[PDB]
Amino acid sequence: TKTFKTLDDFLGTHFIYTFDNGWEYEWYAKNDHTVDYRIHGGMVAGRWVTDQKADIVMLTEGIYKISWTEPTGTDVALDFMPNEKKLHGTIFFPKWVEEHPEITVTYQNEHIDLMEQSREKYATYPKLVVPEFANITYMGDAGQNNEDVISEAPYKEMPNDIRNGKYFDQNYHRLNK
Amino acid sequence: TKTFKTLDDFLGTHFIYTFDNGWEYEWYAKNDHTVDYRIHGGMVAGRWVTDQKADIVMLTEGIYKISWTEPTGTDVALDFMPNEKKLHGTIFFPKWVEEHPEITVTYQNEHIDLMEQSREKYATYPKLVVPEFANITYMGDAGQNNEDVISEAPYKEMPNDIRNGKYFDQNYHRLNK
| Residue of A63, A125, A129 lying closest to B60 (CB–CB) | A63
Q: Reported resolution in A?
A: 1.4
Return phi, psi of residue A154, to 5°. Answer: -70, 150
Angle CA B81–B54–B100, to nearest 5: 95
Q: How many CB atoms within 10 Å of residue A171?
A: 9
* Residue B152 falls in the annotated catalytic set: no
| Alpha carbon distance A169, B169 (integer Å) | 66
The residues pairing with B65 across neighbouring beta strands, listed in sequence order, are B57, B79
**Residues sharing a CB contact under 8 Å with residue B165, sequence separation 6 or more, in sequence order:** none
Residue type, B168: F
User: Is the peptide bond prior to B126 cis by the omega test (within 30 degrees of 0)?
Assistant: yes
Phi-psi region of B114 (alpha: psi -120 to 50; beta: other; left: phi over 0): alpha
Technique of determination: X-ray
State the Rg of chain A over Cα. 16
Q: How many helices (H) and strands (E) does chain A have?
A: 4, 9
Q: Which of A33, A75, A128, A135 to mutate to test the interface with B (most CBs of B within 10 A)?
A: A75
The residues pairing with B35 across neighbouring beta strands, listed in sequence order, are B29, B52
Q: Which of A88, A98, A118 to mutate to test the interface with B (most CBs of B within 10 A)?
A: A88
B160 near B40, Cβ under 8 Å? no
Q: Between A and B, how many residue pairs show a Cβ–Cβ distance under 8 A?
A: 83
B52 near B33, Cβ under 8 Å? no
| Alpha carbon distance B38, B121 (integer Å) | 26
Element (H, E) at B56: strand B55-60
User: Is the peptide bond prior to A94 cis by the omega test (within 30 degrees of 0)?
Assistant: no
Torsion of CA B40, B56, A57, A144, to 10 degrees: -150
* Residue B122 falls in the annotated catalytic set: no
Residue B20's Cβ-count burial label (10 Å; 0-12, 13-18, 19+) is exposed
Which of B17, B24, B25, B37 is the catalytic position?
A: B25
B136 near B87, Cβ under 8 Å? yes
Q: For strand A128-141 and strand B13-19, is the pairing parallel, antiparallel, or unpaired?
A: unpaired
Q: From A80, A70, A64, A72, select the one nearest A32 (Cα to Cα).
A: A64
Number of domains comprising chain B: 1
Residues of B in contact with A129 (CB under 8 A): 55, 67-69, 75
**DSSP 8-state class, residue A3:** P
| Residue of A55, A75, A119 lying closest to B75 (CB–CB) | A75
Q: From A34, A1, A42, select the one nearest A18 (Cα to Cα).
A: A42
Angle CA B72–A98–A107, to nearest 5: 110
Residue type, A173: H
Residue A44's Cβ-count burial label (10 Å; 0-12, 13-18, 19+) is buried
Q: Which of A52, A79, A87 to mutate to test the interface with B (most CBs of B within 10 A)?
A: A79
Return phi, psi of residue B7, to 5°. Answer: -60, -40
Q: How many CA atoms lie within 13 A of B102 on its CB side?
A: 1
Residues of B in contact with A98 (CB under 8 A): none
* Largest distance between two CA atoms of chain B: 48
Range of the domain at A171: 1-177
**Residues sharing a CB contact under 8 Å with residue B11, sequence separation 6 or more, in sequence order:** B29, B31, B32, B56, B144
Angle CA B14–B17–B22, to nearest 5: 155
Residues of B in contact with A63 (CB under 8 A): 59-60, 63
A97 near A128, Cβ under 8 Å? yes
Residue B164's Cβ-count burial label (10 Å; 0-12, 13-18, 19+) is exposed
| Alpha carbon distance A163, A177 (integer Å) | 19
| Alpha carbon distance B78, B92 (integer Å) | 11
Phi-psi region of B29 (alpha: psi -120 to 50; beta: other; left: phi over 0): beta
> Which CATH number characterizes residue B56's domain?
2.40.128.20
| Alpha carbon distance A132, B71 (integer Å) | 22
